[PDB]
Design an enzyme around this catalytic site. Sequence first.
Site, PDB file in Angstrom:
ATOM      1  N   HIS A  78      13.033   0.470  -7.353  1.00 48.68           N
ATOM      2  CA  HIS A  78      12.676  -0.813  -6.761  1.00 48.68           C
ATOM      3  C   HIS A  78      13.888  -1.347  -5.963  1.00 48.68           C
ATOM      4  O   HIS A  78      15.037  -1.105  -6.333  1.00 48.68           O
ATOM      5  CB  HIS A  78      12.228  -1.802  -7.829  1.00 48.68           C
ATOM      6  CG  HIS A  78      11.567  -3.042  -7.295  1.00 48.68           C
ATOM      7  ND1 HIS A  78      10.727  -3.039  -6.201  1.00 48.68           N
ATOM      8  CD2 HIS A  78      11.639  -4.323  -7.704  1.00 48.68           C
ATOM      9  CE1 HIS A  78      10.253  -4.260  -6.007  1.00 48.68           C
ATOM     10  NE2 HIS A  78      10.821  -5.069  -6.877  1.00 48.68           N
ATOM     11  N   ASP A  88      11.664 -11.072  -3.237  1.00 46.52           N
ATOM     12  CA  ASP A  88      11.033  -9.804  -3.505  1.00 46.52           C
ATOM     13  C   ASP A  88       9.552  -9.906  -3.108  1.00 46.52           C
ATOM     14  O   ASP A  88       8.787 -10.490  -3.841  1.00 46.52           O
ATOM     15  CB  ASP A  88      11.151  -9.478  -5.000  1.00 46.52           C
ATOM     16  CG  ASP A  88      10.482  -8.168  -5.382  1.00 46.52           C
ATOM     17  OD1 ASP A  88       9.991  -7.473  -4.457  1.00 46.52           O
ATOM     18  OD2 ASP A  88      10.393  -7.755  -6.589  1.00 46.52           O
ATOM     19  N   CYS A 131       7.751  -1.127  -1.861  1.00 43.76           N
ATOM     20  CA  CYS A 131       8.895  -2.035  -1.936  1.00 43.76           C
ATOM     21  C   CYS A 131      10.008  -1.836  -0.911  1.00 43.76           C
ATOM     22  O   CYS A 131      10.494  -2.808  -0.340  1.00 43.76           O
ATOM     23  CB  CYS A 131       9.523  -2.114  -3.369  1.00 43.76           C
ATOM     24  SG  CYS A 131      10.383  -0.578  -3.767  1.00 43.76           S
ATOM     25  N   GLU A 138       0.795  -1.205   0.000  1.00 49.58           N
ATOM     26  CA  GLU A 138       0.000   0.000   0.000  1.00 49.58           C
ATOM     27  C   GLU A 138       0.848   1.284   0.000  1.00 49.58           C
ATOM     28  O   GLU A 138       1.959   1.307   0.508  1.00 49.58           O
ATOM     29  CB  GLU A 138      -0.982   0.023   1.170  1.00 49.58           C
ATOM     30  CG  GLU A 138      -0.343  -0.125   2.526  1.00 49.58           C
ATOM     31  CD  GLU A 138      -0.461   1.085   3.477  1.00 49.58           C
ATOM     32  OE1 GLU A 138      -0.245   2.266   3.096  1.00 49.58           O
ATOM     33  OE2 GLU A 138      -0.731   0.842   4.660  1.00 49.58           O
ATOM     34  N   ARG A 144       0.036  -2.415  11.893  1.00 49.08           N
ATOM     35  CA  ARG A 144      -0.895  -3.035  10.967  1.00 49.08           C
ATOM     36  C   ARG A 144      -1.154  -2.184   9.724  1.00 49.08           C
ATOM     37  O   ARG A 144      -2.259  -1.955   9.306  1.00 49.08           O
ATOM     38  CB  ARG A 144      -2.212  -3.408  11.692  1.00 49.08           C
ATOM     39  CG  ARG A 144      -3.047  -4.462  10.955  1.00 49.08           C
ATOM     40  CD  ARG A 144      -4.242  -5.045  11.715  1.00 49.08           C
ATOM     41  NE  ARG A 144      -5.482  -4.393  11.295  1.00 49.08           N
ATOM     42  CZ  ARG A 144      -6.259  -3.722  12.114  1.00 49.08           C
ATOM     43  NH1 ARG A 144      -5.960  -3.640  13.386  1.00 49.08           N
ATOM     44  NH2 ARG A 144      -7.308  -3.111  11.666  1.00 49.08           N
TER      45      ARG A 144
HETATM   46  N1  ISZ Z   1       8.965   1.395  -4.188  1.00 53.17           N
HETATM   47  N2  ISZ Z   1       8.639   0.951  -5.301  1.00 53.17           N
HETATM   48  C1  ISZ Z   1       7.627   0.089  -5.348  1.00 53.17           C
HETATM   49  O1  ISZ Z   1       7.009  -0.194  -4.331  1.00 53.17           O
HETATM   50  C2  ISZ Z   1       7.191  -0.421  -6.752  1.00 53.17           C
HETATM   51  C3  ISZ Z   1       7.644   0.225  -7.917  1.00 53.17           C
HETATM   52  C4  ISZ Z   1       7.197  -0.195  -9.177  1.00 53.17           C
HETATM   53  N3  ISZ Z   1       6.340  -1.204  -9.254  1.00 53.17           N
HETATM   54  C5  ISZ Z   1       5.852  -1.829  -8.171  1.00 53.17           C
HETATM   55  C6  ISZ Z   1       6.263  -1.459  -6.885  1.00 53.17           C
END
Ligand code: ISZ
Lengths: 269, 273
Positions: B108, B125, B68, B37, B63
């Site tokens: 990423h 990942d 990423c 999120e 929570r």
């Molecule tokens: N921080 N980058 C991400 O969370 C992400 C970037 C591109 N696609 C999916 C996830």
Amino acid sequence: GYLTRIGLDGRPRPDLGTLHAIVAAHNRSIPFENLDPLLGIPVADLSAEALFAKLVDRRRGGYCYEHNGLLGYVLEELGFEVERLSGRVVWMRADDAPLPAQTHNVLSVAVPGADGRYLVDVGFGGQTLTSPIRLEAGPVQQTRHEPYRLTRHGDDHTLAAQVRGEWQPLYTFTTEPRPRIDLEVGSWYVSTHPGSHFVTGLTVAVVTDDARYNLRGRNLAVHRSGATEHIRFDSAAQVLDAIVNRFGIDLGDLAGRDVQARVAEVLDT
Amino acid sequence: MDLGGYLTRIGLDGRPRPDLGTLHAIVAAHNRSIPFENLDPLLGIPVADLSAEALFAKLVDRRRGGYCYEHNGLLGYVLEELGFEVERLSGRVVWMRADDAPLPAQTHNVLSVAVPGADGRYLVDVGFGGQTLTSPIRLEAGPVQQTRHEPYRLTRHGDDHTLAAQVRGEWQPLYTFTTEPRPRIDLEVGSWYVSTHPGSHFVTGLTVAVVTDDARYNLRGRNLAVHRSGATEHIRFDSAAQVLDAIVNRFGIDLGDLAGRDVQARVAEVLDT
Ligand SMILES: N=NC(=O)c1ccncc1
Ligand SMILES: N=NC(=O)c1ccncc1
């Protein structure tokens, strides 16, 4: 068999409350489907024997002439007075589109203890009425789902529903009672004419308290508050699985026809 | 470091051995438990701090999910605590870009993990969103590798590895990366960009995802896509009120955490972006 099919318990009394209860239970229990026309099997016989046999005993659904046919006979036998009416489907049609054929069959029902007549229609598919409404031009009538309204121009009545906001005309009808033979000519047309929406593809529908389900080919639409839901099935195998398990249609009297293969040809029609 | 709290958050318990079987179980448990999120960035709250203390406080104690840097950040610290050796890698997301499009930013972060008892390193990942990896795979260019869902494949050209997923029969490149290990501060600079640059995908709209055994869930604005075996579902929410209801009750995200920010009014601006 019919009462059990729809999950009711004995013999109900011929009154307005009973009409509301049978409509609700019919709605959620006998699905709209066109598997017979889809497979080249006409819906030609609208007798009580044929309809009870198919929609009750064999656990199939049907389309308008089958649903409203069956409910017609059921309600007569309970003591309602029933006239069978025919109409023309104007749903989503361009203004200045040609006059549609009489392809829809609905009921006008008189109820001991009530004064006028009720439009009963459980066979229109995914947008079908989920309550009887008064056969009365003017008022907006509440149903178990959306508001509906009848208007009248001469002897032509139009049913409209307030669907996701907008007022949509569904069909027009007159209150002339139709003999079974005239319904059978129209059902022959809808189930055999090569341009019929019910010959060119698969439509299955059912209505619960909370949602209207409508399947065309691989595409299942589900309409509930706050959201529209679109399920796309990968192949005919998933569509049949939805027909049998989600919609509860028994495929046994179609043993020896290649149902899956035919469904595969109409996933995108 | 609160190892037991993390394991509890992801539905596991006990203390597992640092082996390949454990790596698979923790990936699958994290995938179903902690959603992707970007509510913080959407609401103008940067994702600036990638320390174990900050990621644990958000993703475990409160929570919330994250994006990423937060997911793989958290998992990287957990994985070292259990006795795996972990390198953080950065990459460039190429998912669906034109063949001629400019080089993407490094936005990423993924993990390269040495597992006691197994040869070579594993790509891990859990942070890519709805199409994230659901198994560790060998960080080995060439072969097609099975996961708990679709086949994925690494290929190599120069010092660039590309990860691709076989998505409904079609091979799609997801992102490219190198195996140069990144210090935390380089990740933090990247996360600053992704969470504050006005053209970031994670600033201009809402993305929420979770992956179960049976389905990948992916929410962008009002559109929820669910990919299951044999069917896709597309749910279109009427308004931000239904979108918030999904965030809270379907994805299990606690919004009480963001009180005083008017989440609904901001989601009402991005239903279609
Ligand atoms: N921080 N980058 C991400 O969370 C992400 C970037 C591109 N696609 C999916 C996830
Ligand atoms: N038999 N005709 C029907 O069932 C029907 C025709 C058009 N629209 C809905 C239902």
